[PDB]
Write a protein that binds this ligand. Sequence first.
Ligand SMILES: *[C@@H]1O[C@H](CO)[C@@H](O)[C@H](O)[C@H]1NC(C)=O
Ligand SMILES: [Zn+2]
Length: 208
Amino acid sequence: HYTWPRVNDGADWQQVRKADNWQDNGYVGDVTSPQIRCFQATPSPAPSVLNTTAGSTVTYWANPDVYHPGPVQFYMARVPDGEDINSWNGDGAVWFKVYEDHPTFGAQLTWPSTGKSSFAVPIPPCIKSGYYLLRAEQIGLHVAQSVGGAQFYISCAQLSVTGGGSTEPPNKVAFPGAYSATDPGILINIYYPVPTSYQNPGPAVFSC
Ligand SMILES: *[C@@H]1O[C@H](CO)[C@@H](O)[C@H](O)[C@H]1NC(C)=O
Ligand SMILES: [Zn+2]
């Protein structure tokens, strides 16, 4: 139970759209629901935007700290030049993955997110300049052996990216749409038998 309330030096929900779990630190359990995107049953803009440049790093904060076993992943979606980031919600297949972590294999799985509050998110240096939505995600798999058991902790930040390139991320996906309740990385028993491989749900990470 944790939220993803801030980016860089900003305050709670300042550049981050207020997630529906800002009070209860709850999670999203239905990969077909509207909340799977930005944890908002009804889209609502964040009061501010975070300025950053392509090639730099954005720090996404979890509160208190990620403690359920599972992967952390980040996605981005570009706002069209003719739209306003305060009212563009990222409908359709416009999201591309920019980061994902992998567990370490042994008698039991260890995750590189466990106990961390600060996460370094790399903004591809080649993507086109413009406003973007940055989706933070952590999937808790401690009771994911049954359909609908995985627990999604999400939020979306509003960014202004300058100095980019002209490379367009291929195979973009939608939320909902990118995940299936039976994906091997979502419906899984991480305890027995201990997995020796792990397939992160969603598309491949985009790299320049
Ligand atoms: C962020 O960039 C915008 C331009 O889109 C600018 O208006 C704003 O002042 C910048 N924020 C600051 C002061 O860092
Ligand atoms: Zn929890």
